[PDB]
Symmetry: D2
C-alpha cells in the first residue's frame, strides 16, 4: 500500500533502547518484539507528544529546575507561557472540580470520566498552537517556545493495568509530554491531602508503571513517566501479598478487608527505591512543606540511585505562612532544586486564581457596578508593560489570524473582522 | 400506559396565553393546536428551565434592574452568586475563545459547534446545584437562591429557522432561563464590536424570534426571549426584499451580492419596534458607552411600546476611562435602569478576570516562585471576611457532600475524605 | 424564591416507603431524612425515568414476561418497538465494542468512559421520542407506547460506592427505567462468558445495590434495580472477609493476592438470597442455556423469597443449536417465564444484526455491485407488509416533522423538504 | 528548541506544487508563502490523513473504479473492508439520522453540530486500526489494507469560508482521505433528493473549494477534494450576481429574496466546468439512475477537461426496479466506470442494512422468541465460508489483543479473558 507510518523493526527499537542516553537506567521487563507485535501495520505519528517529551527531558537536564502551575483552560496555559513559564501542569483535582466531561463538580476521588484529562491536554495544546499562530503573523518573537511541555495527571489509572494503558495512550494522542501515576487503589482514590487513602501493593504499582511505559513504546514516543507514592499519610493497603510491604503491615484489618499499615517517610523511601527503575521522576506526597523532610527523602533515595530526579508538589492544600516564614518561602523551590527536585508545581493554582478573581470582581460589581470592572481593566492596561496582551481580546483569540485565512481565500472579501472594530478604534 | 408527562390540551394552552399576565403584548403567529401537534405523546418537564425563567421574569419587575457578568466555567458562576449576583450571563464570545466543544480557540464568528452553549448552560446549573447541596448540609443560609437564572447567547441561530429551534430546545433542556438572538447572517456572524457585519431582513429575524418562542412553547416553559439588533454599525444586508429595510438601502451591491445599507440609531429604532411584539427584551449593540445615545433609543422605542424592557451590553470592548469620567462610570448602570434597561451585563468579564489573574500569578511565580503564590493565598484568606469560601477548596468542590453520601451508604466506611485531611488540620 | 421543584418532606417520603406496594419487601438501610439531606433546595423532575420505571414495573406484573434485544443505536431501538417489543436492553458489551465515548473498539472489560452508557440511554430516548412525534402528526396509532422502558448496564460501577452513585444518577438523568449491577471487581471486570473473573465480597455488592437505590431515591424516581451475580463461573474473589463467602474459599492464593473460590450454582443461590432484599430482580450468569439449571436456581431462591422476580440472559455467547434441539429453543423463553424469569434479553443482538447484515451486503456488493443492494431494497419493500416503514427513509428520520415545524413558523415558506422530493415522487 | 514538526519552506512547497503530478491541473489562487504564514512554528503530522489520501489517489488511477458503501459505525466499516471493499463512504445523511453529537434523530438539513462527521471519521479509523491489530497477532493475511481511505461529507460547510476551513481541518485531524462540498446555501441545506434546495453563486462555491484546499495545504496533506453540484433539481439561487449563473435566472424573486432559476443538466455542466480547476472529482446529483444522462454529463465535462475524474451517488432515494431492469442494474457501475465515474457509492447503505436487519430480527423475536435469533446465528456460522469472523464476537472486538497487552505487562496474570471463555469452549 504505502510506506506512510511503517513501523520500525524490533531490531531498530532494541538498538535505540541499548544506545540512546534517554534510556539509561530504564528497566523494561518486556521485549522489543513484544512492542512490535502490538503496533499493527501502521504507527500514527504523535508530533506534539514527541516534541513535548523531548523538550521536557532536555529542560530537566539543562535548567536549574522546571516549575509549573496547574492549568484547567486553554487560555490559562497561554498566560502561563506568556509570563515566562516553560511547562504546564495538568491537575486531575482541577479537572474534577471544574473541567471534566461529566459536567459535574467533583471532589478529587477519580469520579469523572477517564478521558477527561486527555481532552484537556488536547485543549491546552490547541490554545498554545493558536497563540503560536498569532505570534507568527504578528512578528512577535518574545516567546521562544509556545508549545511548552504538558505534564498530566494519570491518577491511579481508573482501573487495572489495561485502563492505565488506555489512559496513557489517550494522553499521548492529545500531545502530553509526561504523565504521573500513583500507588492508590483507583476505586478509593483521594487527593494526597485528603484522608481515607488506600495503597496497593508495591508490585501492583510497578505493573502500572510498566503499562504506562508500554503504551508510550507502542505509540513510539519517549514520554516522561512519573511515579508518585502516597505512603506518607495512607494507613490502609489492599493486601499483604508483597514482601516489601509486609514490614509496615500491623495485622489489623477493616470490615472492607483492607490491611492497616504504618505510614511515614520510611515506606515512602522503600517504595521510591522499588519504583526507581520504572520511573523518570519520583514524587512523594507530604503533609507539610518541609525542606528537612524533603532532604531526608532525597538523600535516602540517591544513596542508592544518585542520578534519580525527583518531583515536588508545592500544594495550596498547605497553609504556607502557618508553617514557614517569608524568607524560607522565598528560597523554597531553589533549595528543593539543589536536592534534586527537578520538576516542581503548584497543583491548584488555576482553581484559586479563577475562583478568587471572579469572587473579587463579582463582589465589587454587586456593590458598585461598572466602577469595579473598570478597576480590573485598568490593571490590565498597566500589565501591558510586563508583556500582557489579552487587553486586546479580539486579536488574543485569533481575530487577526482568521482575517488572514479569509483574505487568503478571497482577497476582496467584504466581511473581515478587525477593520472597523472597536478594538482597532479604541485600543 | 401512563399519565406521567401527558400534554396539555390546546384549550388549556390557549387559556393560559389569553389570561396569564406573562403573555400580555406577546404575539404568537401560530396557534395552540400547532403547539400540541408538535409535542408527541409525552412532554418532558424541564425543571430548571421553568424555575429559572419564572425567577428571571419576576426579578425583572421586582428589582431596580438585574445585572450579570459573563461566566465560562461552573466555578465562575458559583462565585458570582456567592458574591451576591442574581443572574448569570453566558457569553458566546467567551465560549468561542475558551470553552467550546471543538477544543479550539476561536474569534467570535459562530465557528464552534452549535451545541457548545447548551453544554455550558448545563455545566453552570450543575455547579450551582452542587453549591446548593453543600450549603444545605453545612446549614449555610447566606445565599437565598443558588440557582440564579442563566441568560444565554443564541448568536444568529447557526443557520435557518430550524437551527434556531433546535438551539433553543437544547438551551431549555440544559436549564436556561432566557436566550438572545441577533439579526446577523449566521454564516458571517461577528461580535457586535467587530467589523464586517451583515444584517438579514427584518422579517427574517421575526421568523427567528418566532421559532425561539415556538421551541419554548413546545417545551412547555416560559423562556425569556431577547432580541438583539446589530444595525448601529452594520453596513451590509443580505437582501432588499423587506419594505421596512428599504429606506436605508443605497442601491449599491457588493461582489458577494450583499446590499450596502445606512447604519446608525435609526435602523436600530425601526427594527426594535418591529421586534417588540416578538421579544420580552430588546437590545441594541452600540459602539461606545453613551448614556445620551441609550436614552435616545429608549425614548424612541417606548414612545410606541411604553412597557417594553430593554437590555444593555456594558462591553469590555469599550475603553471605559477613555470615554467617561469616574462619576459617570459610577452611576452608569443606575442611569440606564431608570431608562428601562432592566437587564445589564458585562459580556467578557470572565475572559478578562481569568486571563489577567493567571498572567499576574504566573509572572510573579516566574520571578519569585512560592512568594507570588502566598500573596494570592493570603488575599484569599482576607476575602473570607467578605464571604469568600474557596480557600477551603476540598469542601468547596463537595468533599463533605460526597462524605455524606458515603456514610449514608455505609456509616462504618474506612475511606472517607475530610477526616485526616490537611484542610481539616490547617484551615 | 419559587416553588418549582420543591423537595418532599421526609414525612412524605417515609409514608410512600411504608405504604406504596412498589416498596413491599424493599430494604433501605438509610433513612428518609438521609435522602432529604442530600437533595438540596430544588429537585429536578426526570419525566422519562419516572414514566419508564413505572411502565416497566407494571409490565413485569401484567405480562407473562418482558423480553428485549440489545440496542446500540437510536434507530435500532426504534425498529425494536415498531416490531412490537415492549422494552429495550442497553448492553455495556455492545457499548464497549461499537458505541462508547472514547471512539475505540474495546472488549467487555470496563475500559470505556463511565458516562458512555448514560449517553446511549439519552440517544435511545431521543430516537423513540422522534418516532413518537412522527407517528402523532401522521395519525399512526399502530404502536401504543413508543417510549418503551430502557434497562441499562451499570457493569461493576466503575469503582467504589460513589462511582456507582454517579452512574445511577446519570442513567436516571438520561431517562433509564432500570439498571443492573454485578458483583465483580471493577478493575478486572469481564463479560460473564469470558474468563478471568474476580468477585467482590457479598457485603460489598450489597453496598453497591444500596448506593444504586440511594441515587434513585435522591433523584425521586422508582428505578428498577437488578442484581447480577457472576459466581457460577468465577473462581477468584478479592477477599475472604465476609463470612457468607468463606464456605467457598479454598485457601489458595494468586500472586496478585486474590483468593481462589469454588464456583457453581451453590454460591449463586447464596448470593442471590443475600441480594434479594436489595434488588427488584436477580440475575445469575450461566455457562450454557439450560432449563434444568435455571429451574434449580429459581426454586432455591423462591424457597426463601417466593415473590422474587428473576432475569435471564439469552446470550449470543452460547452456541444455541450445539446445546438444544429446535423444540427446546422454541419454548425456551416461555418455560423460563413460568419459573419466574420475568425479564429476558438477548444482550448482543444489535452487534450481530449490524455486523452480519453489513458483511452480507458488502460481500455481495463487492461481487455484483448494484444487484446486491437492490436485493436488500426489495426485501425492505416486502417488509412493509409486517409494518416496516424505513424504506421511506426521509420521513423515518423526521423530514415531515421538521416540515411541520417550518410551516408553523412560516406557513408560506419556499424551502420545505418533502414537497418535490424523490421520496414523494417514487415511493 | 526542537526540530520535530519543523515546517517546510515556501520554496519546498512551491516546488512540489510545480512538479508533483498529484497537482497537475490544480489551481491554487493563493501562494506558497500564504500557506507558510498560516502554519505557526510546528506542523502536526497527520499520518492517517496522509496515508489515506495517498492510497485513494493511487486507487483512483489503478482500479477500474473505486466503490464504497455508507458507514455510520466503526464495526460497519470493518465489515465493509473484511468483505473486500477498498474505500469507506461517510454519509452526512446517516450521521444526521443516527450518529451525530446532538444525540437527536434529524433529517438531512445540516441540523447537527459541525464536528459530528469528524468524530465519526476518527471512530471508523479507530475501528479499522483495531481490526488491523487483531489481524497481526492472529497471523491473518486475508486483508491487504485494513486502513481503507475514508471519503467524508462536508455538506455545505456549515456557514462561510471559515466554517468550511475548520471542518476540513477537523476531518484531516481525524484521518480523512477525501471530502466533498456542495453548492447549496448552508442555512437551507437539503439532501440532494429532497425539495426546497437553494443554490449559491458559482463563485461562492469556488471560494468553498479554495478554502477546503487551503486547509489541506496548511495541514500539509494531499486530501482529495470533491465538488458536488445540486443544480439538476434546485429551482432557487441566493443571488444573480455571478454572470455564469445569469443565463438560468428568470427574474422572479420569492418572498424571502431568493431568485428562481432553470434547473437541469445544463447548469450542472456549466458549474462542473467552473469547478474543475478546483476539484479532484466532480459529482452531479440526479433525480433518477440514468446511464444516458450520466453519459451526457461526463462527455460534456471531459470534452473540455479530458482527464477530469467524476463521482456518482448510487442513491437509495431511487426506487431502483421501477426505473431499470435487472440486466441494466447489473451493469450500472461498470458502465459508469467506463465513462469516467471513478468513485461510486451507495450513500444510505448503512442506514438501510441497520434498520432492516433489526426490524427483521425483532419482528421474528416478538413472535417466536429464541427461534428467530438462532436463525441469525446459523446464518452467521454459514457466512464463515465467505470470510465472516464476527460470530466469534470476543476476539472480533479485541479480547485477544488486550490479553496480549496484559501478558506483556504481566505474563503470570490470573485475570486474562479468552482462556475459560464460552467462546473458546463452544465456538
Ligand atoms: O495539592 C493538592 O492537595 C491537590 O492536588 C491534589 C493532590 O495533592 O493530590
Ligand atoms: O462585548 C463584546 O464586544 C463581546 O460580547 C461580544 C459582543 O458584543 O457581541
Ligand atoms: O451475553 C454476553 O456474553 C455479553 O453480554 C455480556 C455478558 O454476558 O456479560
Ligand atoms: O442519497 C440520498 O438521497 C441522500 O444521501 C443524500 C443526498 O443525496 O444528498
Ligand atoms: Mg491528582
Ligand atoms: Mg529511574
Ligand atoms: Mg455573542
Ligand atoms: Mg415585547
Ligand atoms: Mg455488561
Ligand atoms: Mg427483592
Ligand atoms: Mg450529505
Ligand atoms: Mg480538476
Amino acid at each position: 500500500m504505502s510506506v506512510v507510518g511503517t513501523p520500525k523493526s524490533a531490531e531498530q527499537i532494541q538498538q535505540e533502547w541499548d544506545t540512546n542516553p534517554r534510556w539509561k537506567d530504564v528497566t523494561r521487563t518486556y521485549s522489543a518484539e513484544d512492542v512490535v507485535a502490538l503496533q499493527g501495520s501502521v504507527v500514527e505519528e504523535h508530533t506534539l507528544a514527541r516534541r513535548g517529551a523531548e523538550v521536557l527531558w532536555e529542560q530537566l537536564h539543562d535548567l536549574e529546575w522546571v516549575n509549573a502551575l496547574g492549568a484547567l483552560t486553554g487560555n490559562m496555559a497561554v498566560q502561563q507561557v506568556r509570563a515566562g513559564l516553560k511547562a504546564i501542569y495538568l491537575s486531575g483535582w482541577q479537572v474534577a472540580g471544574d473541567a471534566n466531561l461529566s459536567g459535574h463538580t467533583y471532589p478529587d476521588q477519580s469520579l469523572y470520566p477517564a478521558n477527561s484529562v486527555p481532552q484537556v491536554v488536547r485543549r491546552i495544546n490547541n490554545a498554545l498552537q493558536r497563540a503560536d499562530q498569532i505570534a507568527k503573523i504578528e512578528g512577535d518573537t518574545s516567546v521562544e517556545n509556545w508549545l511548552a511541555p504538558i505534564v498530566a495527571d494519570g491518577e491511579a489509572g481508573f482501573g487495572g493495568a489495561l485502563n492505565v494503558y488506555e489512559l496513557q495512550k489517550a494522553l499521548i494522542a492529545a500531545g502530553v509530554a509526561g504523565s504521573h501515576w500513583e500507588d492508590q487503589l483507583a476505586s478509593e482514590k483521594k487527593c494526597g491531602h485528603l484522608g481515607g487513602k488506600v495503597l496497593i501493593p508495591t508490585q501492583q504499582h510497578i505493573r502500572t508503571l510498566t503499562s504506562a511505559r508500554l503504551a508510550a513504546d507502542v505509540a513510539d514516543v519517549p514520554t516522561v513517566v512519573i511515579a508518585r507514592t502516597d505512603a506518607e499519610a495512607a494507613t490502609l493497603i489492599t493486601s499483604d501479598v508483597d514482601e516489601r510491604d509486609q514490614p509496615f503491615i500491623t495485622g489489623e484489618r477493616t470490615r472492607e478487608g483492607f490491611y492497616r499499615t504504618k505510614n511515614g517517610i520510611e515506606p515512602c523511601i522503600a517504595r521510591a527505591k522499588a519504583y526507581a527503575p520504572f520511573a523518570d521522576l519520583i514524587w512523594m506526597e507530604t503533609g507539610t512543606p518541609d525542606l528537612e523532610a524533603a532532604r531526608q527523602f532525597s538523600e535516602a533515595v540517591k544513596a542508592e540511585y544518585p542520578d534519580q530526579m525527583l518531583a515536588y508538589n508545592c500544594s495550596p492544600s498547605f497553609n504556607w505562612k502557618k508553617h514557614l516564614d517569608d524568607a524560607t518561602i522565598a528560597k523554597f523551590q531553589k533549595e528543593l532544586a539543589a536536592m534534586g527536585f527537578k520538576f516542581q508545581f503548584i497543583t491548584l493554582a488555576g482553581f484559586h486564581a479563577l475562583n478568587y478573581s471572579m469572587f473579587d470582581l463579582a463582589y465589587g460589581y454587586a456593590q458598585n457596578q461598572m466602577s469595579a470592572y473598570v478597576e480590573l481593566q485598568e490593571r490590565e492596561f498597566a500589565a501591558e508593560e510586563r508583556g500582557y496582551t489579552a487587553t486586546k481580546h479580539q486579536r488574543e483569540v485569533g481575530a487577526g489570524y482568521f482575517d488572514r485565512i479569509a483574505t487568503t481565500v478571497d482577497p476582496n472579501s467584504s466581511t473581515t473582522a478587525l477593520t472597523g472594530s472597536t478594538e482597532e478604534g479604541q485600543f
